[PDB]
Design a protein around this ligand. Structure first.
Ligand SMILES: Cc1cncc(-c2cnc(N[C@@H]3CCNC[C@H]3OCC3CCS(=O)(=O)CC3)c3[nH]c(=O)c(C)cc23)c1
Length: 136
């Protein structure tokens, strides 16, 4: 009915918005290491250290599978990408500092894009849609 139709429109443009944001992050060359899942040959112990891996391609997949009801849930997976890089790469060799700084840069960039371009009242409507669906 009308309620369900208005709900789907809201989420449709949320997905269009998040899909545009995720594309702007993957094409940024600084974040290329986060745009695809890791190759285990490069990091054979990665799945023993990182219990919940995440990347930008997987984020796109979850956008299309309708897994995100809010922009905050989208940012939780961006934050997961960053905290995983901080957990797997310790503050030691010079290469470690590079990827750790790129991870925090990726996290700050994504939060700043959402904060500048997402209407707060559109966002609150998404938050209300999610809470209604979780408890119904
Ligand atoms: C081309 C490629 C494909 N798949 C995985 C790697 C890789 C390889 N090594 C890692 N950690 C090591 C652990 C020991 N200290 C050096 C770190 O690599 C630093 C290097 C900096 C330049 S980079 O292009 O960002 C790849 C990481 C990684 N640490 C990671 O958190 C990730 C996501 C990847 C990674 C590279």
């Amino acid at each position: 009915g009308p309620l369900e139709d208005q709900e789907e429109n809201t989420l449709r443009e949320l997905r269009l918005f998040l899909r545009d944001v995720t594309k702007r992050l993957a094409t940024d060359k600084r974040f290329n290491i986060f745009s695809k899942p890791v190759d285990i040959e490069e990091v054979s112990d990665y799945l023993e250290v990182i219990k919940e891996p995440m990347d930008l391609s997987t984020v796109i997949t979850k956008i299309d599978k309708h897994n995100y009801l809010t922009a905050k849930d989208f940012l939780k997976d961006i934050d997961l990408i960053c905290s995983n890089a901080l957990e797997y790469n310790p503050d030691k060799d010079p290469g470690d500092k590079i990827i750790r700084h790129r991870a925090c840069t990726l996290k700050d960039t994504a939060h700043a894009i959402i904060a500048a371009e997402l209407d707060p009242e559109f966002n609150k409507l998404c938050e209300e849609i999610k809470e209604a669906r979780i408890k119904r």
